[PDB]
From Swiss-Prot, chain A:
CHCR repeats lie at residues 1-93. Belongs to the clathrin heavy chain family. Clathrin is the major protein of the polyhedral coat of coated pits and vesicles. Two different adapter protein complexes link the clathrin lattice either to the plasma membrane or to the trans-Golgi network. Acts as a component of the TACC3/ch-TOG/clathrin complex proposed to contribute to stabilization of kinetochore fibers of the mitotic spindle by acting as inter-microtubule bridge. The TACC3/ch-TOG/clathrin complex is required for the maintenance of kinetochore fiber tension. Plays a role in early autophagosome formation. The modification Phosphotyrosine is found at residue 30. It is found in: Cytoplasmic vesicle membrane; Membrane, Coated pit; Melanosome; Cytoplasm, Cytoskeleton, Spindle. This is Clathrin heavy chain 1. The C-terminal third of the heavy chains forms the hub of the triskelion. This region contains the trimerization domain and the light-chain binding domain involved in the assembly of the clathrin lattice. The N-terminal seven-bladed beta-propeller is formed by WD40-like repeats, and projects inward from the polyhedral outer clathrin coat. It constitutes a major protein-protein interaction node.
UniProtKB/Swiss-Prot annotation, chain B:
Belongs to the clathrin light chain family. It comes from the Eukaryota. Residues 2-52 are annotated as: Involved in binding clathrin heavy chain. Clathrin coats are formed from molecules containing 3 heavy chains and 3 light chains. Interacts (via N-terminus) with HIP1. Interacts with HIP1R. Clathrin is the major protein of the polyhedral coat of coated pits and vesicles. This is Clathrin light chain B. It is found in: Cytoplasmic vesicle membrane; Membrane, Coated pit. The lineage of its organism: Eukaryota, Metazoa, Chordata, Craniata, Vertebrata.
Length: 125, 52
């Protein structure tokens, strides 16, 4: 199914659980990115960084209110808002700012990702 | 390179206009320091004059 098509690719992404090692679902889904089901399933499953990376348009403003909320291991971020400032001037990387930061000791990995791609202003603010 | 020159040429001009933000002080220094210390030389000079 993961590799089915597009047509019934939104009819079963709602009724595909039946006990299994779905351990390949997320992986294959991550290998085969279509964002329209990485929630309708991820909200019945798990695997996140492998959510904020594979596909672009990001998961949109539809992956933050449920992303940095938990907080995970450093990295996948040195990518995200990094790749944001240069492209996507929606200012979607100021929300994701204090968002991904939420840390009691980081900010070192956070300075080769807000520079090389012409930052400042937004950074000094 | 593939990302090394879009990096600075939209952030290098910081260094440019700051060198001209340099300027000033130095040149300002002596220009003004000139018209001043000399006014001082007359300060003492008129010292001489009256006092005598």
């Amino acid at each position: 199914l993961a590799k089915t098509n597009r047509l019934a690719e939104l009819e079963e992404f709602i009724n595909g659980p039946n006990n299994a090692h779905i351990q390949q679902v997320g992986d294959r889904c991550y290998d085969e990115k279509m964002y329209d089901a990485a929630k309708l399933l991820y909200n019945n499953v798990s695997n996140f960084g492998r959510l904020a990376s594979t596909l672009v348009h990001l998961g949109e403003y539809q992956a933050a209110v449920d992303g940095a909320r938990k907080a995970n291991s450093t990295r996948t971020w040195k990518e995200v808002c990094f790749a944001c400032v240069d492209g996507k001037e929606f200012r979607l990387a100021q929300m994701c700012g204090l968002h991904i930061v939420v840390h009691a000791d980081e900010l070192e990995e956070l300075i080769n990702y807000y520079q090389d791609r012409g930052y400042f202003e937004e950074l000094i603010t | 390179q593939a990302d090394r020159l879009t990096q600075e040429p939209e952030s290098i001009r910081k260094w440019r206009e700051e060198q001209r933000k340099r300027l000033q002080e130095l040149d300002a220094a002596s220009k003004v320091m000139e018209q001043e210390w000399r006014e001082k030389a007359k300060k003492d000079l008129e010292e001489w004059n009256q006092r005598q």
